[PDB]
Design a protein around this ligand. Sequence first.
Ligand code: AC7
Lengths: 554, 416
Amino acid sequence: PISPIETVPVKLKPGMDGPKVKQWPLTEEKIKALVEICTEMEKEGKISKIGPENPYNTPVFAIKKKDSTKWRKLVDFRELNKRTQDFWEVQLGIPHPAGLKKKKSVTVLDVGDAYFSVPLDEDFRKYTAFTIPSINNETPGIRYQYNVLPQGWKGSPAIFQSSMTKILEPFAAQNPDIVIYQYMDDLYVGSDLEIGQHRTKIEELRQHLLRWGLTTPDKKHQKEPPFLWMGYELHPDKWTVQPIVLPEKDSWTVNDIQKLVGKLNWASQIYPGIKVRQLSKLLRGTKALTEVIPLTEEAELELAENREILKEPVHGVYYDPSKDLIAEIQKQGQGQWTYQIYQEPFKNLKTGKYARMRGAHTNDVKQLTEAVQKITTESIVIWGKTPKFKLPIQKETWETWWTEYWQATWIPEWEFVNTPPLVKLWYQLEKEPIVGAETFYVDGAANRETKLGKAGYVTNKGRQKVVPLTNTTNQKTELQAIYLALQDSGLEVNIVTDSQYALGIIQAQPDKSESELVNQIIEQLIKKEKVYLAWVPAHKGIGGNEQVDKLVSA
Amino acid sequence: PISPIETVPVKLKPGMDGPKVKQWPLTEEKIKALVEICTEMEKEGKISKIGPENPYNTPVFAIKKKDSTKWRKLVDFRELNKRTQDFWEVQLGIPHPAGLKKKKSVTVLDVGDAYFSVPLDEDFRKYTAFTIPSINNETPGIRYQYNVLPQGWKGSPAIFQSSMTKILEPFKKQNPDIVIYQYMDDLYVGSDLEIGQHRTKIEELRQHLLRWGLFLWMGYELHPDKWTVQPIVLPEKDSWTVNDIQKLVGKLNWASQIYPGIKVRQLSKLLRGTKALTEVIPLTEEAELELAENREILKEPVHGVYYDPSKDLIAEIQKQGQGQWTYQIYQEPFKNLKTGKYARMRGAHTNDVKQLTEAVQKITTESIVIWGKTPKFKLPIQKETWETWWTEYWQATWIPEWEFVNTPPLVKLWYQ
Ligand SMILES: COC(=O)CCCC=C(c1cc(C#N)c(OC)c(C(=O)OC)c1)c1cc(C#N)c(OC)c(C(=O)OC)c1
């Protein structure tokens, strides 16, 4: 006296129609197989013979899994899928081991024996019709349609999980002391109860699933540490990635390292320190899918620090809601950062890396801020809360930075951690002109066609300079001019420019750039004791900006 | 006992599909709060669980209005709103009350609950689907759909405009000079009284609305002021340094894109010559005249600037430091319709983002009052920082649009 699984109303995309594909000519041997199969399935209730009305048809095949017995039918709804509506695929991404809480006992029920005991929408069945061709086609092929969720049809996964959940809902509700997890053919149930009171409440489950007929094997077991799940290695109280075997190859191609990039990042979520900068920049742009490209001398000393990080298999533990969550970051250079999230010393729930965003200029503080936001979002996803941070930056440094940064910025609760190299401010522009310091009026200008230009300055003390330049632009001459003033002035200096382009670069406060020119300037600024950069509008007869502007043109 | 025995026909914009916005990660507490909230809305029948046959989705989260500490469910209907038939009530909207922005005072009311007493057109319900996410994709998300008019939807205030008009007559007939405006889930009440009699008079409108079948009780005080567009002012000094004249010339040059008559020749002249930045320059006869003439041009308003209901409003914000922010609202560059200076508040000069988020809400509120619609924000913050921590400080039932400026504007101080 079992109760039915409520059916899910389905429909085909608006304006479209059901599939009308031709059936493939099968061999006499294959046909008998299908007939044997379709004969039992009809008995079980799975399918049902239809008349000639149904104008719909979906290709059907049979295949022998090599070195294993019998045949298994296989329908191709490739076309019924392209005509089926959209379903809320709630299968978007699975949990992260680091998010799992350890349980004294964890069982596994196999409910694949339900994917078929779940009915299909009545008015939709007519769209799953398929034909079994007859031997020698001297007879009408046998017609069929589904009465359940077909294997391979667009919405079978979505509809199955939904039904399973609904049935499970009440059980979970009245069993807070246990934890059920449903995903595919398996149902993971765990609890911190006596192994006795556990297999107990399990029976109840297997039994609760009975009130809907759904049968769950009278299983004993087929598994034990290490639980190989979704590329991981799970254990009763620890996890890590599948054995990450670094290819001991001599000739690395695009795929060779590219399958080493997406396979190294995987490894990075637990092995502290992994890098992929000098390796991903070797195939960022490259013709073909594969190709034996040379590995930079830099992509050899980091990959070597991989067989020492990927040498000793490290393990990530499980999350404990009672302990605080901590996130630690380190600077690694070239715009690389790594972090470990843990609750207790050295017991990393997980680890990871962060690469700088591709841009012209940048500074370590902005980079840190970015890594922090990333870790925050990843943390909310995995644990539902923001971790406390332990960063390599002084409180004073951070205060100075955010109170003077033109943009709004913020980092959640954090503490300074004295683990070098510390992130810091390399220079700091004055807010007012410096009394007693020499005032350098600079300018640059180039010729659009000849690419010839000049850069220079004139100061209040009479100091002057103008240098001719070839293969330059207006922007470069504007930067070179500032550079000259910096090279030729004392420790304290006032620079006047009309270059909005220059100000924009400097006001972004970069400590590193793609441009060697900007970097030289950064280098000079680091050396100075005080620099006040003032801007004046061009061609206004400001003079000193007008005098140098003349010397720099023609 | 209020619930229209019928439902008003509603559809999406011609040739536009329902929303399918991703739900973003939520903290464990916000999740728990949404679970409690929805479990009740379900019994009260405002919502119902849905099967996987529904592909539509709209983001959802939790906040807290001013005073009550109690969690409030907020649905980001931005996508659905722009895809929902622009409600062209056969009555032709509500002509923006040009008189609300002139009233010495304005009180803001959260009449949202009212909406939940009116049923939603059965054919539109699937479009209001939202998900209460689970931590670490452990369990599947709880899916729901609305049965009643949902707070935050553009259609709620319209589908309800009928019931509201009559729930107000016994007040609007009485108080002839008072102005009442509605936007989203808010009711705006302006007057020319004084705090004393303007404050208690609202209570009258509170119970009145409370007797027509109706976070009911919350009210933000407002009094919008002068200089829709603030004047540009030049310093007045007895001794100018070369640096002072350089900045002044910079500001005037900039101002001339707004006021063509501005001249900076007689001032640049003092600059001709490479002098020390901190040296004092005496103003010449000619120079002070120009500084005088310019000063006069800046007093008058800008040339024939007008609002164009077809075009959207742009809002720019600048971080000035020490908890001070500036902003300008416009449609065409150099043609401001409003400029302001939102000073120190909660940011408690420790959180730049909380401040910016309050500024934005304040700018949006001012915007609702003047033109009856929110403006498009240009935020001085990295997208990644803002997207991570804008919802932690948000408190309005509505939400505006925004973009990000990544290059430091040269004109920061000129707006100070
Ligand atoms: C809450 O979200 C999840 O659980 C996601 C599910 C993750 C997958 C497994 C899992 C591992 C654990 C561990 N350790 C668990 O305990 C902390 C749990 C648990 O508690 O959930 C009920 C689940 C898993 C995968 C297997 C595969 N393949 C497998 O067969 C080898 C076995 C197994 O147990 O065989 C004996 C277990």
